[PDB]
């Protein structure tokens, strides 16, 4: 069958949010307040098209 296409590590490297789970859970509501206006573009992309390797931008 037709083989799969995957993006290489020339693109899959964003500087990660290297904080742990405690502070990331504690800072939740203000993260929803100031930011998370443009994340719904990402989440709508992910729910309309069921394909990661598409909405990675």
């Amino acid at each position: 069958p037709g083989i799969v296409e995957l993006p290489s590590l020339e693109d899959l490297k964003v500087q990660e949010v290297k904080v742990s789970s405690s502070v990331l859970k504690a800072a939740a509501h203000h993260y929803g307040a100031q930011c998370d206006k443009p994340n719904k573009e990402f989440m709508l992309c992910r729910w309309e098209e069921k394909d990661p390797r598409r909405c990675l931008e």
Partner: protein, 71 residues
């Protein structure tokens, strides 16, 4: 002559009866052979409305926003 007049039938009556009756049963025989040929090809290919055993009804398939994004 009196016996033929009061009891029996004309050969016209019986003759046209035979001819009509052969017309009727020729229709019956042709429909019967055509029936079994239609049945054998309809079982073979399945295009007809007879041999359609019930598959899944898709009305219960309700697409919606789920929990997991990759379904």
């Amino acid at each position: 002559r009196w016996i033929a007049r009061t009891f029996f039938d004309a050969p016209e009556k019986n003759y046209e009866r035979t001819m009509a009756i052969l017309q009727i049963e020729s229709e019956k025989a042709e429909l019967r052979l055509k029936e079994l040929e239609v049945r054998r090809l309809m079982r073979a290919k399945g295009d007809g409305p007879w041999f359609q055993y019930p598959t899944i009804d898709k009305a219960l398939i309700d697409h919606s926003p789920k929990a997991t994004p990759d379904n």
